[PDB]
UniProtKB/Swiss-Prot annotation, chains A, B, C, D:
Summary of subunit composition and partner proteins: Homotetramer made of two disulfide-linked dimers.
Pfam hit, one: Peptidase_C15
Class in the EC hierarchy, top level: hydrolase
Domain of life from the UniProt record: Archaea
Keyword Protease: yes
Main location: cytoplasm
E.C. no: 3.4.19.3
The protein's name: Pyrrolidone-carboxylate peptidase
Listed HAMAP family: Pyrrolid_peptidase
């Protein structure tokens, strides 16, 4: 068994992206006889697609779990659907702002996550980790990779399972926000890392 | 040096109140040569006043830090002011619902917290703990005790410092909320307990 | 030219549904040489499908604009995508609660709205009406009808344009909410009705 | 009978302040045998105090209702208390940023609004206008004037009634916010103006 976990670099002014640590922290660990690979993707259209495709092609994971930062969200959110579209509210890390454009022309309008999202959520609740199902991963880079991953799956037959998980800001990221007159929700890094491992575990239990 | 920390029992349907554990967890510990006392107050008008008065009178703390649950708040909030009024949106744990009534007739309309609130907040930020200054502790039991405590201070000369701190829901309390179609902010119990100790420490450093 | 506008009856305990009045208010009016038909759909799975199919089949509209109540949303929201799924958080008006089930088995995972959503939004802004693009209409009845409508469109060739618009609570609906300790956003009925007419107009300008 | 209504000029980057129109719109009108005076105050510490004091001294109102913009609030909010403190998160329109400073040294920590706030709220509800009681008017200019007004009242014996009312953004102000990736609540200008007249009316009915 091989599992691929990806995270994203900082973006939109944020100095950190909790998903970057998550990916690095999970890279190389083993859960049962399953080997986990952690890779950090750039918040850049195009380049991110290349890194993703090469990684999937090089590792050929059975399961692919992509994690991203969802500023403002109060709990762990498991994405149910990836849509074939890009409409960036802000530019990516290269300065490009793509608006109303398909990710893969002619490809399906959308793909359902193949991760056992309800069991993952239920398992997190048992661990006392707030989590829910999101029906939109935005139309920025998180959705971008989530879509490409599921498309690769429907196209090449692997990974067997692919999905996306969004995590809230970690506490320390809230500090400089307070000054700007507003305090968004946060979740400790430990609970976030824990949530992803749980997701991997439930995914492994399910996959075959 | 003697420090008094209070918490509240569950209320409003909640099965737990993180401040109850905090009080019990801090009871009996020593921070430097300072003895900390932890007491859980009932979410009941009148009865809560008696317990508070007796405790203050029995222990005669130099510092009094009262902690409560603020459902919906996303970070640690340090109260700046206690108002001489009661206007309960819901009844207390005894079924009574007091509306537009003074706490202490003839007493001052309000009292400023005597805790070094700005330093406490600043110290929490350094620890990476989101925190801010709240200018209203509500008009329920949190405000009730905060007011009575500061009134006891202005009246008897002790404690020298008195204030109130509100904490968010802890993660596990969010689980059953998700079903009811809504996910409020939360903060891990560990960070909450930590925040209170920090507050105590900064208070001790300040007090004399 | 024929335009079909639908609304929903009250649901989830709400005594009113602003979209019901909207539909009734727009029924029978003419915008240019375009005849508008307003119909109120029941917040009931299955039954709602029948009413929708019959209405579309009987009127055979060139444009179909379905409106619904989105409790909590602060401005007019134009839906970008309808997904082939049902996962009701609450039961419908008949007491049934469908979870994780497709709307049309074997049908596409999702459909993009064919209404000129960006122009509609832009036109509303010019009128000073807050509006934005929503990328998820929920998985309750709004999404249900939005999907069925676009599926009917891809299947029968009509209507040429189909989409969904969610409106906030109208002010009067907020009154009894205040007691329950919370005040959600609202938008006056007049602005809501106005927004829908604008949408119809932009749709007509676009359609051919 | 004489009633004084004040509003504020634009501030914090906002190009408009709905309270400015409200004041101008109500200036000179008569409600029964009561003469209403509408004055716009500058969002400037010090200068605002002078304008307020001169106005109160020149008109010597029986009732003083001060209105302000509360960005983000979803309904009409009637302030219950004014605190003797300034802690500006942002500078005023002259560039000054006052932090942790009393408004009137030696004066009471706080003043309760003398307007019949509960009746005003109840009357607005009957009109279908969402409204609630706020227990904090912030520590910026709204609180500043609210305090000074009630202090003038306790000091000079007039006005007999003084209070503050905060209104949400009006719809048009939300338009350019949408771009910045966020849509706060709003309330039509008409409902806002209406709410203030109601407040004046209830105040008149009450005052003597």
């Amino acid at each position: 068994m091989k599992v691929l976990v990806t995270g994203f670099e900082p973006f939109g002014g944020e100095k950190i992206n909790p998903t970057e640590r998550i990916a690095k922290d999970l890279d190389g660990i083993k859960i049962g006889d399953a080997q986990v690979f952690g890779r950090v993707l750039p918040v850049v259209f195009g380049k991110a697609k290349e890194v993703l495709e090469k990684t999937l092609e090089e590792i050929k994971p059975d399961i692919a779990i992509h994690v991203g930062l969802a500023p403002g969200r109060s709990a762990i959110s498991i994405e149910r659907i990836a849509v074939n579209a890009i409409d960036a509210r802000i530019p990516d890390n290269e300065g490009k702002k793509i608006e109303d454009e398909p990710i893969v022309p002619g490809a399906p309008t959308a793909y359902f996550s193949t991760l056992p999202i309800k069991k993952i959520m239920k398992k997190l609740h048992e661990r006392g980790i707030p989590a829910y199902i999101s029906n939109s991963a935005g139309l920025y880079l998180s959705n971008y990779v989530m879509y490409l991953s599921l498309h690769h799956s429907a196209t090449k037959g692997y990974p067997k399972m692919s999905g996306f998980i969004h995590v809230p800001y970690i506490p320390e990221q809230i500090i400089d926000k307070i000054g700007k007159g507003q305090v968004p929700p946060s979740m400790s890094y430990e609970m976030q890392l824990e949530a992803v491992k749980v997701a991997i575990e439930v995914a492994l239990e399910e996959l075959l």
